[PDB]
Symmetry: D2
Subunit: 505 residues, 4 copies
């Protein structure tokens, strides 16, 4: 197979970075390295921040916050509007960096950048809303209201698999809420973050906004830990497959938004439109090479249609074009690294050991074409029961197929796992669709009808329940997590209730 | 005179039996009920074990499986019936509040009335619990956000509001489809037994499931088992919990105390301010989370404000909380008195001047009880003792000149519950409430740090814990959000223009 | 047998005195109370003049000046007390509803319970009535939106819901700081007198102002003076008003009737559909604004659906509404019967087939009363008589093949209150509720055209009038919005970068 | 004085129109005429629509609506975003047309165009919101929700004095709500409307949106009446100083948004910052030559400071630079036409007849410099009582000064007039500011503290009470007036309540 060479990838990365305003000589170094899953090779070395630099960055962000929090929110929205314009102008440059570092095909990388633009649009509108309330008070000659105020520095921890959209959800909303941002991107995807920050620094300069509104800290795990532990960071937002962030921030009386992984199922009922269901399940299971927190990993199929659903999924998986994510023909690019491939192969072998049958895929493709990179065909595994390996999230394209008879059994099977991010049901039956969404239905934070588990849009709150961590980001009123509520009682009567009737004047 | 222990004991037993408590089933020898009025033990109680906690959680979870599909308006009908029974027994319950918490009759009655008011509010919520419907970018699709019952709610309350805090949590949680396991303060079990018996009668009257609410009486080990239960998705603690519950991916509502200040500007109405400050600092013997502990006074009026406050503190009527003439009842126990004396001793060692109060009153009248005059201490700066709250009536007076420095002094402490500003100046009032003003969860103008009501969200920031209870949309913490997209178009349309065709 | 007029009269007088009405003060010779059960007059009543209306408005406006500064939670306390008195007298009031409106006991009881439920909902609203706070583009400024009491509310109700419609309006209006002048149907004055006497007792118990609510009994000239008053900023009319009130810059809430349809798809559960359709078409003798009048059935099941409906209509129990076996009580008067017969005669002249019903029942048993079997008419198209509602139990059956044409048939009429679809198909259900589906204010799935409840906004589109009552945020129509910007910066800053310096 | 010549104005107008994409040969004609208050002269003739053309336009807008209402709202928002970009690009061209037709100074014309851009920003955010509700139902195995649906064709009637912003408030919101628009602009300001429509038609072409989303009908009163009476127009929005629109639309069971004029007051208390109060009152009274519905026309001053407030306002009015609104030095341009000047002079003469004293202004400036145009100095009139002429709105810069003693008297004086649009209070006293805003305070739809009566921002709902007409447009949830509410009960239980327990199956 034809896979881009590491040198050609490095040239495309340097072009994209320079077009987005990154000063290559300023960010290059020998402390860390940028890399690409397309070949598995290092691209070039980078400077690093120390933990001491993290503290300096947090304090500079707090200084900016002291000015930004009294900057009128519609003015803060005008900065985010300028940034959305730069993102639109550089959409393909940023998408190229997403493909290079996350291994996403062109269409998915462009779609991820489009999420950034969409949430910028949403946040500009929010900058004239951020609604609190006015309400009656029981006290004569008083007034009562609830207001929302900027919180402080927001620490953003993102993962390799959505290296730009997750930060954009957090930064666009946080900035219009009067917060500032310190971003710790994945050690696997620093270049996407450098390009994003450079475009925002240009927006900031054009707007005359404070220079410290957003900063990227490049480093390994000690860098992230220092961010998480800062007493100057009242909110930490951590997305990706992290589990220690919650307790450690709680211990210093901080706030967290946590979205920590998913093990997402779809139910296929006897009345399901099978052409629709197969197409939707293929994208949900195989998109991003199965490396979304929202990836479809469990398919719960009614026994009357199980055999035909497996036959059609087997053929679909066998026809998936795997290859270089820069080629328009490709639908499946590589896994992120060798450790991900190892975990996938161990899960598939555990599954057959636990009684399962591998129906399609699972094999490494053209290993000699790019020996450092791991391209795999998505695996389809039929399972007699929801055993230990099925209940574990493996960050790889593995779709386990379980059968059911009663709808309540399908719901129990969906709910049995420790995670709780997203769920779907495919059905033409009005009653089954409502029962799946009812309070005793699927227990996840996202629950869909005739749609798979992935590909949310910006207008809804995004996040999940149980061990997914409970946070919400992006749409609806998820913005409230980035501000503090105040309840204000205002007395204009000139008097106060006298305790026991006694006047001490 | 001070009420006798024998008379207090008989009133407590009468209140309990009238509220439906079976004294034979609850009496024992593992724990004792007590009263701050004399310091004496009332009688012994049965206690629960950690294994009893696990059994109570399983019964609450079984009831939750039925309650969560009971229509919310039907769940509200139960809470309306509970409010009626509370109204019926308002005086009986208030007597137990005075007996166990030591608060004066009028405040005990007000606390029971808070329970009734939150029942009425929750009945209205039972037809709302609003989510949203909104557009989607995909043709032939629909998008909405729905709210669902969460599960078993663990409630941990303190001695100082022994019935209203649980009522905030239980009324809202029950209409939200949740069930409740309640661990009251070991200092105030009798109030909780009475509350639970009245709710159990309402449950019987409604045909509702028996496990909707349960009280577990016990020591620290009982509370820890509740906090650690994997079947308790929400823990509400008022008065270690935070990271423990976060470690098992649970949710918390935390309101952990306050160190509340009011700013007095040069244009303040001094009669209003003095009355407001006395009642917020001395009320409940300084044992409210919202108690006024810091007064930040402009230097040009500081001397006259301290003289007026000194005169008022010297006149405060201290005595038996069953006497209507009493304004200040006793502190809860000897440790509370000891911590108060230690704070005042530290304050004077840190440069402060004791202007009034601090002395113990009529100790021979009840040697086991601690009636103390609230203390007023003028301080040269916001020193260590000022920044850390003592749960006692001590009012520290600090001075300022520029309003931004008064705001900084308000915000400098680790707590963040409530704040107030006394001023006739329109701009000063607004600056105090502005994003760069007071940083607390509650910030008021010309009313004190206890100015709050059922319809407002109640809670604070920083080390107060971040939770919100009672009013506005605090109910959302008792439910789980779901984002639902529905495709009725018969085709796969992917968001953001993604294309997965070959 | 049918209840005797003498027994009905005595029950009415007993109900009225028990609800606090002074029979001596209200009896007269200008108007008469009546009963559809026998058609007979009960006794004579005093009537008000247009000058009495003007005096009632001035008294309501004087009370409004006090009520609008009474804190909303205190206003809610009055409505809670009213709900308690309604609960106390539920059976007495329900008896008057059956006597005057002719509706069966169970429905009369349900209507009084609606009043109690909206009282409970309004008590919750009294702590909400939410406006907004939001950012402003100007530094050192604050922006909010507040809601204020409007003034005197005129309420015009119909015979068919003689107590619940006024309760929707009065409970919400009172907690919103408004006062009420009520003009009930000339056919049902006794229910209104009872309601007002119970509310006046609650007003006395609360120490509230006496003019918060008043009833004016009279003919058309009394209603017109209310509609035309320049001191009545809101007129709510259920069952000329619109442009008249608009001409004096007043506000209206209009719910003027319905011509409601349900669509029956090939996958409909036929037992569910038949039960749902019978109760929505025949209930209240077809005299609900939400009554089912049009059934749009897929051609492949149309024959079997008409046979099942024919069998059910022939079995409907018609009789005295005080007998629990009765499902269909009498029509309100002779004119209602005449209009029904004329519609059925027109339908058959326009090509339709009378499948069942339409005949008058036991006329000799009560020659002044009109008990009729609901009529079922199969129609070849949606002709003139189908498009204009007759306030009578007539169910027209139309057929379709494509769902978009069933939707067009639903939407084609001038009315727009409610609609329903019976289907097992997920996509058909969603299409019916979609922006290009049914155009009505209420659109339901697998429940009939009367499917509504307190927590939902109630009302319709097109010639139904556009108003909304009861639930969600319908309360906003009873208040006035204010947008408030507050400058605390000490400088003039103009929006949009305007510069007026020289 | 130096006033631009009619020929120079015509050249600037033709340049602005052509830059905004208007085809001059297509819109010119001999039925009506464009004009300018700067000289009072006609500029050039225009084609007209007939009433029959109005009906054709309404039906074409309804056809577009049938497609637009199922176009996803975020897609509808993308059109409004493109239109906001064209408005930003042509801001000064449009501002020139606003100056030419309404007579506004450069700063106010640019600010009016900026309102259009701001509401486009707001509406793009709204396109992912348009929030209804989900809520509990009392019925087991049912679900309940409230949804919002597009309404239909919206008829927009605007006035001369805000010839672009009012339509923008209505069109940006209506379009994202899935409605379509037929716009009838003032007969005095057709060119601004032609330019706005041409820019939006370009946005529509770029987006591939339906061609009939917005149309301008140019004509006299018979054209507007036909729009108002159309049974295909479920909402009519009429802004400007109209009073017959309400009843006529009500008679055909349509909906209206009405904002029909104002007679707006500000209260000046003894503690008022007088430098602030005078500066604010001068802009509120004199801006737009007193031709806003929000113009300050009544000043209610405490008797202890009345004399000094009048002295300072007298000097400020005497120093106002009146002249050509294209010159940067000008703060006051001309009144719209001779009829407006006549009404102003008649009001001032009535006022002195009713006991008042003319303290400053009121005289026509340099009549021979532009004999067809009416430039006047704003008039300041001290009045012994709130007499008939004070309670009447005269659409001219006349500021009546009334004195008071008790704050409740000032509030009664504010509330005594038939209008109810906006009110302000200038005070340093916390109690007086709250009392003015309380339920027994000012009765207007807008009530401000230390701000005048004009110059609202886009984020608030705009409109008034009493004879102002009750409508709200622009911000908050004013968008709900452009959609229809539906209450949906969904039964998934398979059963229904059986009446009297009887099962007919
Ligand atoms: N919009 C994407 C985001 C996934 C986020 C993640 O996998 O961490 C989706 O809903 O699939
Ligand atoms: N933004 C302007 C709009 C006025 C509208 C009008 O006068 O018709 C203002 O608030 O003064």
């Amino acid at each position: 197979a034809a896979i881009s060479g590491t040198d050609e990838i490095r040239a495309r990365a340097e072009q994209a970075l320079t077009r987005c305003g990154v000063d290559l000589t300023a960010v290059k170094g020998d402390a860390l390295t940028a890399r690409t899953p397309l070949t598995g090779a290092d691209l070039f070395g980078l400077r690093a921040q120390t933990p001491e630099d993290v503290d300096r960055a947090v304090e500079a962000a707090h200084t900016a916050f002291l000015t930004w929090r009294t900057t009128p929110a519609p003015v803060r929205g005008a900065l985010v509007k300028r940034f959305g314009e730069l993102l639109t102008e550089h959409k393909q440059d940023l998408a190229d960096l997403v493909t290079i570092e996350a291994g996403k095909i062109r269409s998915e990388a462009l779609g991820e950048v489009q999420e950034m633009i969409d949430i910028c649009d949403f946040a500009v509108g929010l900058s004239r809303q951020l609604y609190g309330r006015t309400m009656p008070t029981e006290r004569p000659g008083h007034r009562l209201m609830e207001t929302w105020h900027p919180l402080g520095v927001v620490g953003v921890i993102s993962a390799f698999n959505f290296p730009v959209a997750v930060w954009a959800w957090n930064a666009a909303v946080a900035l219009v809420c009067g917060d500032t941002v310190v971003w710790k991107p994945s050690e696997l995807t620093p270049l996407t973050a450098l390009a994003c920050a450079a475009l925002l620094d240009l927006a900031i300069a054009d707007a005359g906004a404070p220079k410290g509104l957003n900063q990227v800290v490049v480093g390994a795990a000690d860098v992230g830990e220092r961010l998480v532990d800062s007493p100057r960071v009242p909110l930490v937002s951590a997305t990706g497959s992290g589990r220690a962030v919650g307790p450690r921030v709680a211990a210093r009386f901080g706030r967290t938004i946590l979205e920590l992984g998913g093990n997402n199922a779809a139910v296929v009922t006897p009345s399901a439109d099978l052409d629709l269901t197969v197409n939707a399940a293929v994208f949900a299971a195989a998109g991003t090479a199965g490396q979304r927190c929202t990836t479809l990993r469990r398919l719960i199929v009614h026994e009357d249609i199980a055999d035909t659903v497996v036959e059609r999924l087997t053929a679909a998986f066998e026809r998936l074009p795997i290859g270089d994510p820069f080629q328009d023909t490709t639908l499946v690019g590589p896994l992120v690294n060798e450790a991900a491939f190892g975990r996938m192969r161990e899960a598939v072998e555990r599954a057959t050991a636990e009684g399962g049958t591998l129906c399609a895929g699972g094999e490494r493709q053209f290993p000699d074409a790019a020996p450092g990179a791991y391209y795999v065909r998505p695996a389809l595994v039929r399972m007699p029961a929801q055993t230990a390996v099925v209940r574990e999230e493996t960050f790889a394209p593995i779709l386990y197929v379980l059968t059911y008879r009663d709808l309540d059994e399908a719901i129990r099977l969906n709910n049995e796992v420790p995670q709780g991010l997203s769920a779907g049901i495919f059905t033409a039956d009005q009653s089954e669709a409502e029962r799946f969404l009812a309070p005793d239905g699927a227990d996840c934070g996202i629950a869909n009808v005739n749609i798979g588990t992935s590909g949310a849009e910006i207008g809804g709150a995004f996040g999940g329940e149980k061990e997914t961590g409970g946070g919400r980001e992006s749409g609806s009123d998820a913005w409230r997590a980035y501000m503090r509520r105040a309840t204000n009682t205002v007395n204009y009567s000139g008097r106060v209730t006298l305790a026991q009737g006694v006047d001490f004047s």
